[PDB]
Design a protein around this nucleic acid. Structure first.
Ligand SMILES: [Mg+2]
Ligand SMILES: [Mg+2]
Ligand SMILES: [Mg+2]
Ligand SMILES: [Mg+2]
Ligand SMILES: [Mg+2]
Ligand SMILES: [Mg+2]
Ligand SMILES: [Mg+2]
Ligand SMILES: [Mg+2]
Ligand SMILES: [Mg+2]
Ligand SMILES: [Mg+2]
Ligand SMILES: [Mg+2]
Ligand SMILES: [Mg+2]
Ligand SMILES: [Mg+2]
Ligand SMILES: [Mg+2]
Ligand SMILES: [Mg+2]
Ligand SMILES: [Mg+2]
Lengths: 80, 123, 205, 82, 150, 129
RNA sequence: UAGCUAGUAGGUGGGGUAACGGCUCACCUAGGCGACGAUCCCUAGCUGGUCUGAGAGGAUGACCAGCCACACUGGAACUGA
RNA sequence: CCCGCAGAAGAAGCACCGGCUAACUCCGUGCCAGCAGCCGCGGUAAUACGGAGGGUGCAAGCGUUAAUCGGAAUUACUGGGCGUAAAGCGCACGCAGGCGGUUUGUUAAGUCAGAUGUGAAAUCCCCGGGCUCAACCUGGGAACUGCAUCUGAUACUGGCAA
């Protein structure tokens, strides 16, 4: 792996059109407090397998669609 | 107060209303003399202060002060004006560059001639 | 660029001899020094801290015959350079050629010493340097051009040059009219009656 | 093709060239790939006047760069080994 | 090393049947140049009467200050009424830069190379004072070990 | 609300001290302790004491040197509202060096003199002098 | 300005490009975005850096260099690496 | 760049001087004429108007206007306030959000460490070098406080468990 991403599912309800949330804490560049800056990513997963609430590991590939540059790698946990 | 608070809504710095729309930050502006009044000053003072309402190159009509002792400026004279209020004459926020365009310099001035626009007298 | 105006007037206002008529007579008088720099000079200048702080740097300035712009830049250089800002300032002020010409006696007063410089009548390590502010560094070697040597001025110049306390940081002939800036003058050389820290303050705020 | 040439970072009447490797199509004093020497043609006889990292110039030429006319001269004027 | 200076002199009015009766006030500082500084106030119907009356007050009402060379050990904050002040050791560049007013107490008190600044009201009576107290509270660069050690 | 105990410690001290109070107690915790440690080991308190089991009770003995209290000032620095973290090179020094700053690191709660020597850094819990 | 979105979001296949790709098409899924501020409106070329400030900041983007974009306005392609 | 030639010969102005602010007098004028960055000056002795003598400041510039930041801790992150001065919503309940007692395990995102790559040159800064000095030019460092990857550390924070 040249890097990977974790993040929780959020939306499984679409023919491989899976979208994953990614949560980082970051120091406010001005008032020093740490806040949650979220990222959403449109990730491919052939034969639809993850489910809303799943933690998942993810890698950056080429464009699979005007929107998708990431396929999944593994699953982690379920039935949140 | 709160950190959160500043986070949501940052400290904002009040912007500076100018005291002299010589439009767009301009060293001075050209204009034409609408009227050549002379009115009287505020509270403590008492006088007959020369002025002139001036249609500026940029459309603004503005009342401007005429500095010095004595001046030949009438309606239709083309002048140059600079920043410079006159507290005494509320409403007046610009001066007129003596010895510019059709504005004459002050007759006979010896001291401080460059203000009031007077040539170095043939000494 | 040069002051050019009646020059005793200065000392009188500064209240001290700035050595600008330097030449013959000493301990002025035969002038008027002090009690009337103008028409109200008779009067006591009970003056602000700003005033005393002003006249000090003014004094130093009227002395080396330097105008504001350059002086400011001296000060800035001083401050840049490590060491006591005020001392460095004084150092720089001495490193001036014109000064290290009057200081080797080749000229009655610094003004005269300078006329020499600008009149291509000096040579550092061999070569002619006619610009009054040429900074002179240790081991340098400032001579009088053969052309116009032992000519008028330069004689009496080198003369009462010995009447003066007479340097230390510089060793100097008198026959050849050459001489060697041996080292940068220390605080303790020169001074007493000049108060850097003030003219550091003037330029601090 | 890439080339080794003189940029003129001098100063009216007292030139001082940088010698650079760059896309031959760019401006004389423009975007370049890497610097590789310099050339003060008012060097004065005192000391320095034409330093020139040869082993790089070597690399690029090896990779197909062309050289100027003047630079070429400097390399065969630096002598090369001594 | 007597060393003294006055900081501010001021007029004030009293107001009685017959009008305003005026008077002057003096604010002074005296130090030895080796720690020990004091300020005095003292007012009086005329100027010299007041400045004198002050210098005296300042001779007593003198505190001492645990310097460290020509400077301060740690940076210190001082604050009295509307005046809130702050000064810093400053591995002396040259040093002694502050608002002529607390330069005064600094200078005489013997500190040789600080940078300082006054916030809040520049009112002399309260800055030169916020500064005295400022140096006062400042604690010994070792009698902190006295403090601890144990 | 309880929300920030560590300030409450720093404070129960600051206060009792100003109340020339001999001792002072409070609910304990892994963390309170590690700091009470540095506080004693740096000689700002006499000695601590945790007397309980299900409902532990930190207890600190205060000090007074001259007439004064020994702790001349104790402030939070990090806090729930706003966490502070410094890298090693960017660690702070109180009163120029006198007095100290408690910093928690991946190798435990230690002083600034300490963490500095340990070549690392962490969350700067509080200042003390 | 609080909702925005039909090639819209994804899939499958055909076509397409030097190239991945809703790039395009046909068909299917009903999705995609959004108060961590979408949509709408106003203003604006970005940077290295420039001035100021003890710093943190504030302000700014001539002259030098890097990137983008434009070539009377709008729209087009041809030739060609 | 160098040498000769003549003769001080061709070469000084601008603003200011009531306080802040370095620099004071006389004459005119008389709430007029006028000044004025702020305060405020002018109705008979005006250091504040205008002129003169004198002075102070700058100098081939000097003043005026315009413009940015500074002083302004006057949007206060560093670094502020809301009883009476500007400022607590008339009161409560509560979604999102923020924050959250105490223990052990685990996680390693925040946090911290190291390593590597990258952070264009110029500019800034430090030490030098070259133009009679300087501005200007230039060698070499230093700096670019940043970003990413890898591996580590687990006290604090976040997650999971009980
Ligand atoms: Mg000049
Ligand atoms: Mg396809
Ligand atoms: Mg500041
Ligand atoms: Mg077109
Ligand atoms: Mg083609
Ligand atoms: Mg005065
Ligand atoms: Mg005037
Ligand atoms: Mg009169
Ligand atoms: Mg500010
Ligand atoms: Mg306030
Ligand atoms: Mg109120
Ligand atoms: Mg209420
Ligand atoms: Mg806890
Ligand atoms: Mg660079
Ligand atoms: Mg040189
Ligand atoms: Mg935990």
């Amino acid at each position: 792996k040249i890097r990977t991403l974790q993040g929780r599912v959020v939306s499984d309800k679409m023919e491989k059109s899976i979208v994953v949330a990614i949560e980082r804490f970051v120091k406010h560049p001005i008032y020093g407090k740490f806040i949650k800056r979220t990222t959403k990513l449109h990730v491919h997963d052939e034969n639809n397998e993850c489910g809303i609430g799943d933690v998942v590991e993810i890698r950056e590939c080429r464009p699979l669609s005007k929107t998708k540059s990431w396929t999944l790698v593994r699953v982690v946990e379920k039935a949140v | 107060a709160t950190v959160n608070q500043l986070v949501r809504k940052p400290r904002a710095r009040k912007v500076a209303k100018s005291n002299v729309p010589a439009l767009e930050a301009c060293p001075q502006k050209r204009g034409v003399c609408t009227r050549v009044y002379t009115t009287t000053p505020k509270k403590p003072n008492s006088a007959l202060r020369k002025v002139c309402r001036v249609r500026l190159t940029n459309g603004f009509e503005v009342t401007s002060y005429i500095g010095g002792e004595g001046h030949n400026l009438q309606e239709h004279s083309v002048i140059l004006i600079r920043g410079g209020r006159v507290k005494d004459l509320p409403g007046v926020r610009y001066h007129t560059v003596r010895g510019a365009l059709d504005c004459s310099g002050v007759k006979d001035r010896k001291q401080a001639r460059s203000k009031y626009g007077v040539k170095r007298p043939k000494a | 660029a040069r002051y050019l105006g009646p020059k005793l007037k200065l000392s009188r206002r500064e209240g001290t001899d700035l050595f600008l008529k330097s030449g013959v007579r000493a301990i002025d008088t035969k002038c008027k020094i002090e009690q009337a720099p103008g028409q109200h000079g008779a009067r006591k200048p009970r003056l602000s801290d700003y005033g005393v702080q002003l006249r000090e740097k003014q004094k130093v300035r009227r002395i080396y015959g330097v105008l504001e712009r350059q002086f400011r830049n001296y000060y800035k250089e001083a401050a840049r350079l490590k060491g006591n800002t005020g001392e460095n300032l004084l150092a720089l002020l001495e490193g001036r050629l014109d000064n290290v010409v009057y200081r080797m006696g080749f000229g009655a007063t610094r003004a005269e010493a300078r006329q020499l410089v600008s009149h291509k009548a000096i040579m550092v390590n061999g070569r002619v340097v006619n610009i009054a502010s040429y900074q002179v560094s240790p081991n340098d070697v400032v001579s009088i051009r053969e052309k116009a040597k032992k000519q008028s001025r330069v004689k009496a110049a080198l003369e009462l040059a010995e009447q003066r306390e007479k340097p230390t940081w510089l060793e100097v002939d008198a026959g050849k009219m050459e001489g060697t800036f041996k080292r940068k003058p220390e605080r303790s050389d020169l001074s007493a009656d000049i108060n850097e820290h003030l003219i550091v303050e003037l330029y601090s705020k | 093709m890439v080339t080794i040439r003189l940029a003129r970072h001098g100063a009216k009447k007292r030139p001082f060239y940088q010698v650079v490797v760059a896309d031959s199509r760019n401006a004389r004093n423009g975007r370049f790939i890497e610097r590789v020497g310099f050339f003060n043609p008012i060097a004065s006889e005192k000391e320095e006047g034409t330093r020139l990292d040869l082993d790089r110039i070597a690399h690029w030429v090896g990779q197909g760069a062309t050289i100027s006319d003047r630079v070429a001269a400097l390399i065969k004027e630096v002598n090369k080994a001594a | 090393e007597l060393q003294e200076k006055l900081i501010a002199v001021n007029r004030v009015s009293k107001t009685v049947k017959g009008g305003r009766i005026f008077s002057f006030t003096a604010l002074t500082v005296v130090g030895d140049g080796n720690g020990r500084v004091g300020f005095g106030y003292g007012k009086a119907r005329e100027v010299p009467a007041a400045i004198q009356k002050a210098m005296e007050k300042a001779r007593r009402n003198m505190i001492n200050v645990a310097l460290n060379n020509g400077t301060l050990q740690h940076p210190v904050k001082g604050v009295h009424t509307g005046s809130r002040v702050f000064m810093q050791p400053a591995s002396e560049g040259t040093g002694i830069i502050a608002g002529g007013a607390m330069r005064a107490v600094l200078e005489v008190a013997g500190v040789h190379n600080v940078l300082a600044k006054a916030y809040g009201s520049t009112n002399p009576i309260n800055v030169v004072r916020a500064t005295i107290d400022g140096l006062e509270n400042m604690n010994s660069p070792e009698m902190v070990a006295a403090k601890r050690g144990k | 609300s309880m929300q920030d105990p560590i300030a409450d410690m720093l404070t129960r001290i600051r206060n009792g001290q100003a109340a020339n109070k001999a001792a002072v107690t409070m609910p304990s915790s892994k963390l309170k302790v590690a700091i009470a440690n540095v506080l004693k080991e740096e000689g700002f308190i006499e000695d601590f004491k945790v007397e309980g089991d299900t409902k532990p009770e930190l207890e600190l003995t205060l000090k007074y040197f001259q007439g004064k209290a020994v702790v001349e000032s104790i402030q939070r620095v990090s806090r729930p509202g706003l966490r502070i973290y410094k890298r090693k090179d960017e660690l702070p020094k109180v009163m120029a060096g006198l007095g100290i700053a408690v910093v928690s690191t991946s190798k435990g709660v230690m002083t600034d003199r300490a963490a500095r020597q340990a070549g690392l850094g962490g969350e700067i819990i509080c200042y003390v002098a």
